[PDB]
């Protein structure tokens, strides 16, 4: 008791980190089935975004982690403004984090070898704060997410 939400956040953060490491092809120290499924489905979405929303992605420049955080929150706030949650939407949170991370690697001014760790943090926070309860109510990562996409 006193650790349920802590465990949930750390699990979300682990998924977010491993997805972003997959995007940049960074070897993880620790993959589970949830990670494999998430990596497939989210990466599909990331490529779809980079291909089809190029003209909007070209409209901004991700010159800092601070800018990345603001853009992430703005876009995510708009996506989720209707108050609806489903697994597809959760997938897009990870996928757009990846889109922004790729932009940041190309566009960031300061050297930042740790960029993906900082992005994983604000991706995890968004998931927890906006979908954390829904995740718990909808089967979690194993009985909910994996079953949805397998």
């Amino acid at each position: 008791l006193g650790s349920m939400a802590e465990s949930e956040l750390m699990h979300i953060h682990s998924l977010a980190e491993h997805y972003l490491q997959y995007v940049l092809q960074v070897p993880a120290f620790e993959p589970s089935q949830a990670c494999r499924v998430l990596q497939r489905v989210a990466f599909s979405v990331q490529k779809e975004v980079e291909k089809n929303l190029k003209s909007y992605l070209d409209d901004f420049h991700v010159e800092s982690i601070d800018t990345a955080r603001i853009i992430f929150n703005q876009v995510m706030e708009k996506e989720f403004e209707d108050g609806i949650i489903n697994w597809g939407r959760i997938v897009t949170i990870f996928a757009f984090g990846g889109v922004l991370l790729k932009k940041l690697k190309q566009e960031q001014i300061a050297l930042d070898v740790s960029a993906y760790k900082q992005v994983s943090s604000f991706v995890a926070e968004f998931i927890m704060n906006n979908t954390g309860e829904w995740i718990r109510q909808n089967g979690g990562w194993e009985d909910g997410f994996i079953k949805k996409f397998e």
Binding site: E48, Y56, V75, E79, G88
Partner: peptide, 22 residues
Amino acid sequence: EWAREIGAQLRRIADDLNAQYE
């Protein structure tokens, strides 16, 4: 703006993805 259009498209993508996996 670009933020609202990207958010709107992500929502569409997400919901279509969700509907594909009934």
